[PDB]
Structure formats: C-alpha cells, structure tokens
Design a protein around this ligand. Structure first.
Ligand SMILES: CC(=O)N[C@@H]1[C@@H](O[C@@H]2O[C@@H](C)[C@@H](O)[C@@H](O)[C@@H]2O)[C@H](O[C@@H]2O[C@H](CO)[C@H](O)[C@H](O)[C@H]2O[C@@H]2O[C@@H](C)[C@@H](O)[C@@H](O)[C@@H]2O)[C@@H](CO)O[C@@H]1O
Ligand SMILES: CC(=O)N[C@@H]1[C@@H](O[C@@H]2O[C@@H](C)[C@@H](O)[C@@H](O)[C@@H]2O)[C@H](O[C@@H]2O[C@H](CO)[C@H](O)[C@H](O)[C@H]2O[C@@H]2O[C@@H](C)[C@@H](O)[C@@H](O)[C@@H]2O)[C@@H](CO)O[C@@H]1O
Ligand SMILES: CC(=O)N[C@@H]1[C@@H](O[C@@H]2O[C@@H](C)[C@@H](O)[C@@H](O)[C@@H]2O)[C@H](O[C@@H]2O[C@H](CO)[C@H](O)[C@H](O)[C@H]2O[C@@H]2O[C@@H](C)[C@@H](O)[C@@H](O)[C@@H]2O)[C@@H](CO)O[C@@H]1O
Ligand SMILES: CC(=O)N[C@@H]1[C@@H](O[C@@H]2O[C@@H](C)[C@@H](O)[C@@H](O)[C@@H]2O)[C@H](O[C@@H]2O[C@H](CO)[C@H](O)[C@H](O)[C@H]2O[C@@H]2O[C@@H](C)[C@@H](O)[C@@H](O)[C@@H]2O)[C@@H](CO)O[C@@H]1O
Ligand SMILES: CC(=O)N[C@@H]1[C@@H](O[C@@H]2O[C@@H](C)[C@@H](O)[C@@H](O)[C@@H]2O)[C@H](O[C@@H]2O[C@H](CO)[C@H](O)[C@H](O)[C@H]2O[C@@H]2O[C@@H](C)[C@@H](O)[C@@H](O)[C@@H]2O)[C@@H](CO)O[C@@H]1O
Ligand SMILES: OC[C@H]1O[C@@H](O)[C@H](O)[C@@H](O)[C@H]1O
Ligand SMILES: OC[C@H]1O[C@@H](O)[C@H](O)[C@@H](O)[C@H]1O
Ligand SMILES: OC[C@H]1O[C@@H](O)[C@H](O)[C@@H](O)[C@H]1O
Ligand SMILES: OC[C@H]1O[C@@H](O)[C@H](O)[C@@H](O)[C@H]1O
Ligand SMILES: OC[C@H]1O[C@@H](O)[C@H](O)[C@@H](O)[C@H]1O
Ligand SMILES: [Ca+2]
Ligand SMILES: [Ca+2]
Ligand SMILES: [Ca+2]
Ligand SMILES: [Ca+2]
Ligand SMILES: [Ca+2]
Ligand SMILES: [Ca+2]
Ligand SMILES: [Ca+2]
Ligand SMILES: [Ca+2]
Ligand SMILES: [Ca+2]
Ligand SMILES: [Ca+2]
Lengths: 103, 103, 103, 103, 103
C-alpha cells in the first residue's frame, strides 16, 4: 500500500502527477444526463474532470467518485490549497484519480 | 467531454446559460409530496428550480439531483458567487442542469 | 410548478405560512424509537417539528425528510435567517413542509 | 408528539436528562469491528456514547443513529453549546437518545 | 463498552495508540480502483491510512470506514487538533481504527 499520492499514482498506467500548490479557481457541477460530472480549473488554466461513472469504473470506485466530488466542492468553498492531483492523462480534460492537500 | 459549463450546456436542446456573477439571494426547500424540490432566487428576480425527480430523469441523474440541492444549500450559506447556470428553458421556473462557481 | 414557498404551501390542505425572519433559537434531535424526529424553536417560542417518517408520507418524501433535518441543523449552526416556514397546522407542534432562507 | 427534549425523554424507561450547557470537550470515533461508535465528553468528565447499532434498535432508528454521529462531530467542530442530552442510564457510558442545542 | 479510545484500542490485537496532539498536516484521498482509500500525515512524518474496504472488514465497518474518511477531511480543513489515533500496526502505513479529537 502506498504512503503518498505520488507512489499511488505510479501504480497505474496512463497517469501523471500535477503539482498545483494552489486553491481551486472554479468549480462546475452538472446533473445533465450522461454528463453527471464535475470540472475544476486552476488560475493557470489547468482543467480537470471527475469522470461520469461508467464501465471504466469498478463497483468499489462508485462511493469514492462521489466522495471526490464532495471533496472538490468543500476544498473550493474553503479556499483550501491543493498540493497535487493524480490524473489519468488519456482523457480530456485529464481525469482525477487522487488529490492531496497540504498547507 | 466538455471543459466548461457553456460547452456542456450546448450539448442539449432547450437549454440556455444565465450569467449571474452573484450570490444566491434566497434558498427554498420542500418535503411536501410531489413537490420534493428546491428553488433559488437572485436579487435580480431570476428564479430557478431543481426539479422533482421524475420519468424525465435517468437513473444516473438521481444522485446528481441530490448533489445539486446539497451544492445550492451550501453555496447559499457561504455566500458563494455563482458564475453561470445552465438551465432548461422548457420548464417554468427554469430548471437547473449545471452550475459554475468562480470568484 | 410553484416559484416561491407561499405558492407551494397553498397547493396543500391544512397548511399555513409562518413569517419568522429570524435565526433558529434551538435545535433538538432524537434517535429514540418511534420518535426519530427533529424539533426547532424560535425566540418567541414558536415550535416546529420534522415528523417521524410514517405512512402519511409517500416514498418520494423519505429522502426529502432527511434533507430537511440536515438543512435545519446547518441553518442553526450558521445562524441563518429563516424567512418563512410552510407547515401543516393540524400537527402539534406544527410540522414543517417547506423552508425559505433569505434576508 | 412531544415539543421538547425533556418531554420526549420522559416517554421512555431508563432515561434521564443531563443539562450540560457547554461545548463538547472531546469527540472520539471508531470503525473497529463491533465497536463502530462515537464517544463524547464534556469538561466535567461526563461521557456519552452513540451506541453500536444492534438488536436493541428498530429499523427506523438506523438512519437516526448515523445522523446523531454527524451532529456530534459538527457540534464539536463548531464549538456549539449543548443544552441537554436525553440518555439511557442502563448503558455504560450513558447512551444518547436525543440532543438539544441552544444558548 | 469502552469509555475512551485507549480502552477501546486495547480490546484488539495488533493495535497501538499514537498520541499526536497536533493538526493533520496533509490529507490525501484516491478513487483509483483497488486504492479507494485515504492517507493522512502529521508534521513529524507519521503517516496513516484508512484501509481500502476488504474481506478483513465486517459489514458494520463499511459505513464506519466512510465516516472516518469524512471525519479526517473535515478535521484537516478545520485544523482540528487530533489527540490520539488507535491504529493497527500489522499494516503499512498503520491503519486507523479510531480517532480522538480534543484540546
Ligand atoms: C483548454 C483549457 O481549458 N486549458 C488548457 C490546458 O489544458 C487543460 O488542462 C490540462 C491540465 C489537461 O487536463 C487538458 O486536457 C485540459 O484541456 C493546457 O494544458 C496543457 O495540456 C496538455 C494536454 O492538452 C498537456 O497536459 C500539457 O502538459 C498542459 O500544459 C501545461 O499546463 C498548463 C495549465 C500550463 O501551466 C502550461 O503552461 C503547461 O505547459 C494549457 C497549455 O498552455 O492551455 C490551457 O490552459
Ligand atoms: C419570479 C419572476 O417572475 N422573476 C422574473 C424572471 O423570471 C424568473 O426567472 C427566469 C430565469 C425563469 O426561470 C422564469 O421562469 C422565472 O419566473 C424574468 O426572467 C426572464 O425570463 C425569460 C423567460 O423565462 C428568460 O428566462 C430570461 O432569460 C429571463 O431574463 C433573464 O434574467 C433576468 C432576471 C434579467 O437579468 C434578464 O436580462 C435575463 O435575460 C425576469 C425578466 O423578465 O424578471 C424577473 O426576475
Ligand atoms: C412552546 C410554546 O408553547 N410556544 C408557543 C407557541 O406554540 C408552539 O408553536 C406553534 C407554531 C405550534 O407548533 C404550537 O403547537 C406550539 O406549542 C404559540 O403559538 C400559537 O400556538 C397555538 C396552539 O397552542 C396556535 O397554534 C397559535 O396559532 C400559535 O400562534 C401563532 O404563531 C406564533 C408563533 C406567533 O406567530 C403568533 O402571533 C401566531 O398567532 C405562541 C403564540 O401563542 O406562544 C408560544 O411561542
Ligand atoms: C470518565 C468518567 O468517569 N467520568 C465521570 C462520570 O461518568 C461518566 O459520565 C456519566 C454521565 C456516565 O455516562 C458514566 O457511565 C460515565 O463513566 C460521572 O458521572 C456519573 O457516573 C456514574 C457511574 O460512575 C453514574 O452513572 C452517575 O450517574 C454519573 O453521574 C451523573 O452525571 C454526572 C456528569 C453529574 O451530572 C452527576 O451529577 C450525575 O449524577 C461523574 C460524576 O461524578 O464524574 C465524571 O465526569
Ligand atoms: C516514512 C514516513 O513517511 N514516516 C516515518 C514514520 O513512519 C510512518 O508512520 C508510522 C506511524 C507508520 O504508519 C509507518 O508505516 C509510516 O511509514 C516513522 O514512524 C515509525 O514507524 C515505525 C514502524 O515503521 C512504528 O510505526 C513507530 O511507532 C513509528 O514511530 C512513531 O511515530 C513517529 C512519527 C515518531 O514520533 C516516533 O518517535 C514514534 O515512535 C518515523 C520514525 O520516527 O519516521 C517518519 O515519520
Ligand atoms: O478507473 C478509471 C480509469 O479507467 C482506466 O481504464 C482509464 O484508462 C482511465 O482513463 C480512467 O477512466
Ligand atoms: O434530464 C432532465 C431534462 O429532461 C428533458 O427531457 C427535459 O426536456 C428537461 O426539461 C429536463 O427535465
Ligand atoms: O406528507 C405528510 C402530510 O400528510 C398530510 O396528509 C397530513 O395531513 C399532514 O399533517 C402531513 O403529515
Ligand atoms: O433504542 C435504544 C434503547 O432501547 C432500549 O430498549 C434499551 O433499554 C436502551 O439501553 C437503548 O439501547
Ligand atoms: O477490521 C480491520 C482489521 O482487521 C484485522 O483482522 C486486521 O488484522 C487489521 O489489520 C485490520 O485490517
Ligand atoms: Ca479569499
Ligand atoms: Ca490553513
Ligand atoms: Ca454577507
Ligand atoms: Ca449572510
Ligand atoms: Ca472567496
Ligand atoms: Ca451569534
Ligand atoms: Ca452562536
Ligand atoms: Ca474556542
Ligand atoms: Ca477550538
Ligand atoms: Ca492556520
């Protein structure tokens, strides 16, 4: 089991770490059918999604997808500094796998 | 996959973007039967619903509807600035499909 | 579809609007069997319940009942001003159907 | 239907009211098997639990037990004043049945 | 039933109490498949996980695992002082069983 986000991220293909060290600039949320997702941006233009749940996701990920959207909303609203995101870079926008906050 | 609320909104018929750049003026919530909904207003009188769940919604939308009501309540209580809403304009009041927050 | 609490409240028998324009004075919560409910008061002694879920409620109301208790707790803890309550006045204490928050 | 915590408490056997009029001093939470519970204390050493869900509970209490743990956590973090607890005094520590928050 | 985290912790094999008396320094969570988990650190380098749910857990632990991650996120965001953690020391990083918060 990994001890940090960087090591975690390295366990998977198709991923990378972004080091933001910044608060979330915007938070977008949709309930529209087939677009039940969240999008965040940072001041530098970096844009990330929490993907629409699909066949790329196993059943054990479903609660964690919902948690992640909860986390991004409250991080946005508290201006919490995001340290890193682990993302899948085979999606556009890049798709969030993990987040770390330290500040 | 869209990267922002404007492009997301354009994927659908009967939708329009409202650009508010303002906090929510009022938040209303009902548990009464057949009116299990939320209503928000802005100071300019713009009025929006989160629809009662119904046969227009697919299963994947049901958690998202609940999330959106959570988001609107906490946005209201934090006086968070709402940037845009994507709404269905074939409902009265207009029905929320997506929200963006930026400030 | 209604656009405000007053019009929503008027769709139901045995209801009334209370105009409070005040924060919640006390919040009570019970997990005791057959009394799984919330009670709120205002400074003037006005007392309201969220009813114990029962056969008077249709299935769609169940989630809305839980939401309303969440809303009352966070409204209490943020000292949010309650504008109006729509209540059923054939219950003692009067039972909450809807809430509006504004200044 | 009762209108306050005192009257509610008096509907049950083996209960008593504690009048605390104080914030929660400590909040403890366990996920250990058969000990999935919360424990609070006050500065005077008064110690209370939210019981592990068990055969003493009816099904309608299950959501309310979860809600109570939610309430205690946020009350602790907001330094909210606890007015009274209704507890079962046939449990060690005394088991929470209901809570009131006020000044 | 135990009355404090130390006594609870002692009911289990392979556990120990860490006394931190400090805020959480970093919070990490993941939605990646098979790593649906959270990791926290303290300034002294102490690193702890909330384990991925698995066959080592009983059903009552499922909700408690989700609660614990909720608690760690809000404790982080409120800078709440963590008093003690009860952890399993047969996992790397040590796995959280219980948390206490106090000053
Ligand atoms: C179009 C937009 O909204 N933003 C782009 C930004 O891309 C977005 O954010 C990235 C992280 C990714 O999720 C994209 O899918 C998304 O549209 C661009 O970022 C570059 O993205 C490419 C992938 O298109 C590579 O990943 C590259 O490393 C990224 O550029 C870096 O990150 C940027 C935020 C800047 O810091 C840039 O200087 C870096 O080179 C950028 C490219 O300028 O343009 C908009 O911001
Ligand atoms: C309670 C009320 O009557 N308020 C009106 C407002 O209507 C309400 O809000 C809109 C957004 C919609 O949901 C209505 O169903 C609801 O009653 C009026 O809004 C205009 O309505 C039309 C047709 O519905 C369009 O939606 C239009 O975009 C709305 O105007 C926009 O919002 C206004 C508040 C202005 O900022 C205007 O420039 C925008 O285009 C408006 C105007 O008639 O007046 C009250 O606010
Ligand atoms: C704890 C207490 O005795 N408070 C009373 C309040 O009664 C409570 O709150 C009302 C809304 C209801 O849920 C009652 O069952 C509950 O005990 C009194 O409110 C009046 O209550 C009588 C019934 O005993 C009638 O329901 C009457 O309509 C209520 O008054 C209206 O609402 C008040 C809060 C004010 O807006 C008043 O001007 C209204 O006419 C009130 C008033 O007697 O006194 C304490 O607050
Ligand atoms: C950790 C500890 O020993 N604290 C005690 C407290 O006991 C704890 O809190 C009470 C409410 C109950 O949940 C206990 O199981 C728990 O250990 C003591 O309270 C008394 O506890 C004894 C058992 O030792 C009896 O249960 C008794 O009823 C409790 O006293 C009542 O509650 C107190 C908080 C006071 O209001 C007292 O007047 C009440 O009768 C107290 C009492 O000495 O001391 C520490 O806080
Ligand atoms: C490597 C790193 O990131 N941190 C180490 C820390 O280990 C981490 O945290 C501990 C609690 C455990 O979860 C590890 O798996 C994890 O990598 C080290 O902590 C000691 O780790 C050993 C066995 O690895 C024991 O768990 C021991 O209790 C730990 O030491 C206690 O906690 C420390 C932070 C110190 O305060 C120490 O005095 C305590 O005994 C420490 C070694 O000090 O170093 C990094 O922080
Ligand atoms: O679990 C989610 C992930 O699934 C992978 O198969 C896919 O390559 C990633 O882009 C991401 O969607
Ligand atoms: O998914 C929800 C949407 O469903 C559409 O069919 C409908 O026209 C919209 O008004 C909205 O209700
Ligand atoms: O939805 C529940 C409501 O149902 C009505 O039939 C009843 O008269 C109200 O008091 C309220 O309980
Ligand atoms: O509903 C919970 C309560 O049920 C009672 O029967 C029991 O005596 C109490 O100690 C408490 O557990
Ligand atoms: O309940 C969770 C615990 O289960 C035990 O059997 C295991 O030894 C611990 O490491 C921990 O996983
Ligand atoms: Ca700021
Ligand atoms: Ca800080
Ligand atoms: Ca203000
Ligand atoms: Ca305000
Ligand atoms: Ca701000
Ligand atoms: Ca105040
Ligand atoms: Ca206060
Ligand atoms: Ca303080
Ligand atoms: Ca404090
Ligand atoms: Ca600080």
């Amino acid at each position: 089991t990994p001890q940090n986000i960087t090591d975690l991220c390295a366990e998977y293909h198709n991923t990378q770490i972004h080091t933001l060290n910044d608060k979330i600039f915007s938070y977008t949320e949709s309930l529209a059918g087939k677009r039940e997702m969240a999008i965040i941006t940072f001041k530098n233009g970096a844009t990330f999604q929490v993907e629409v749940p699909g066949s790329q996701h196993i059943d054990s990920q479903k609660k964690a997808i919902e948690r992640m959207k909860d986390t991004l909303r409250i991080a946005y609203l508290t201006e919490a500094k995001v340290e890193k995101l682990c993302v899948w870079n085979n999606k556009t926008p890049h798709a969030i796998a993990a987040i770390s906050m330290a500040n």
